[PDB]
Design a protein around this ligand. Structure first.
Ligand SMILES: O=C(c1ccccc1)N1[C@H](c2ccc(OC[C@@H]3CCN(CCCF)C3)cc2)c2ccc(O)cc2CC12CC2
Ligand SMILES: O=C(c1ccccc1)N1[C@H](c2ccc(OC[C@@H]3CCN(CCCF)C3)cc2)c2ccc(O)cc2CC12CC2
Lengths: 225, 240
């Protein structure tokens, strides 16, 4: 699984991308903020399926035991939803593209107490992506790093995960070298991208407090087939 | 500030290292679970004062506005406490070295509700440092990154923008320094960016523990250093 090349790594990651899901909002009925969280919960529940099937296609993931595959997914699912949302909303300044038929701004995000604080953190990350000019090849790499690194500190099983993590790091550097960046530009950009992952984790924790709901071990396992 | 060589970065960060503090000594008062949180709170408060002095000596930190210096320490003070604890406990498997005379295991962490969950995460990070053989020069770099990165996405004036641009230049200088250290230690170029990535990914877990811990301090609640308190220690005058 780790004999793939950097170019083959990106190729596998790109073709494994989940689809962009729509809201079940009846587009001819009056939209309402009281029903806003209903749409966002159903949407996220349906994105989790496609996320599971994306994870099995992350090179090296299915080499772990099913028990470990679940644990990483329990620990990373919210972070992956957020980085996906931030990615979709990247070309929509000041708004979050939850779905093509759910574009919200922070001024629709004050409907519930404790929401706009999370909203602004998501908007800030999207602005950071926009300044970074984050490439889709980098994005699928950052997303795979989240999947593998989120639950590794909460457990040969660990050593393999670290070999895949090192391999993704090789691929990120390969992209930056193929783009013409110098070596310092390469290790500076790699650093900047990984420091963003700290904010996404923080967003996840603060996100989870607001929601407190969590996908059970059995549900993630059923989805894993 | 930005002129410094990596070598000059490292000595500055090493010279700024706060001292290792102690809990109170008393041979007639045997350790009990009862006074633990009182000991730990007193130790945190005393460390916080020394943390301020270290922060002011992190190159480029006082170039920021005083208002943004506080927000960064508001955002990072707990992270810096834990990573300092993890560093002290690195050489002591299965224990957390809050002080040389306050070394605890997780059976003592079981005393307080919800504590052993964070206690076990701190030991896992200590073990992660152990199995990477984290060096002291890398340590002080990671601590400086936490100080500047943790609070930076949560500030948006024209001045706010040049603060953040300045922070990114310092963080860029630290990344250079980490690479220079790892190159100086004799790693190949692949192992350098692989180790840099391993180092920085730990910062994601340290953020995770800090949010976990912040939640736990509030479960039993004046828990956090306030803005005016942080400003007070930061906003020194020139009369000394
Ligand atoms: O609304 C919000 C939000 C809130 C405050 C500020 C900004 C955004 N969210 C959305 C959201 C809602 C409920 C939810 O709940 C957890 C699942 C629902 C039960 N699932 C378990 C089933 C158990 F019965 C898991 C998850 C995700 C959602 C949806 C899609 C997206 O791409 C991204 C997001 C982002 C965000 C994660 C922060
Ligand atoms: O016990 C714990 C702990 C808990 C659960 C699991 C494992 C460990 N901690 C210790 C701790 C306790 C209370 C505290 O409380 C907040 C300040 C005390 C009042 N301060 C505000 C008062 C001013 F208004 C701020 C801070 C720090 C402490 C001490 C020293 C250290 O180096 C590190 C730590 C780490 C840790 C932070 C997690």
């Amino acid at each position: 699984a780790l004999s793939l090349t950097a170019d083959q790594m990106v190729s596998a990651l790109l073709d494994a991308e989940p689809p962009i899901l729509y809201s079940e909002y009846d587009p001819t009925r009056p939209f309402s903020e009281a029903s806003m969280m209903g749409l966002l919960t159903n949407l996220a529940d349906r994105e989790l399926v496609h996320m599971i099937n994306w994870a099995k296609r992350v090179p090296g993931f299915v080499d772990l035991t099913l028990h470990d595959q679940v644990h990483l997914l329990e620990s990373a699912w919210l972070e992956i939803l957020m980085i996906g949302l931030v990615w979709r909303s990247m070309e929509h300044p000041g708004k979050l593209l939850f779905a093509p038929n759910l574009l919200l701004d922070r001024n629709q995000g004050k409907s519930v107490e404790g929401m706009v604080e999370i909203f602004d953190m998501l908007l800030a990350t999207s602005s950071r992506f926009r300044m970074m000019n984050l490439q889709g090849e980098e994005f699928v790499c950052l997303k795979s790093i989240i999947l593998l690194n989120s639950g590794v500190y909460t457990f040969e099983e660990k050593d393999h995960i670290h070999r895949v993590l090192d391999k993704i790091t090789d691929t990120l550097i390969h992209l930056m070298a193929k783009a013409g960046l110098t070596l310092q530009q390469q290790h500076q950009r790699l650093a900047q991208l990984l420091l963003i992952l700290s904010h996404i984790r923080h967003m996840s924790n603060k996100g989870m407090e607001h929601l407190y709901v969590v996908p059970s071990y059995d549900l993630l396992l059923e989805m894993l087939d």
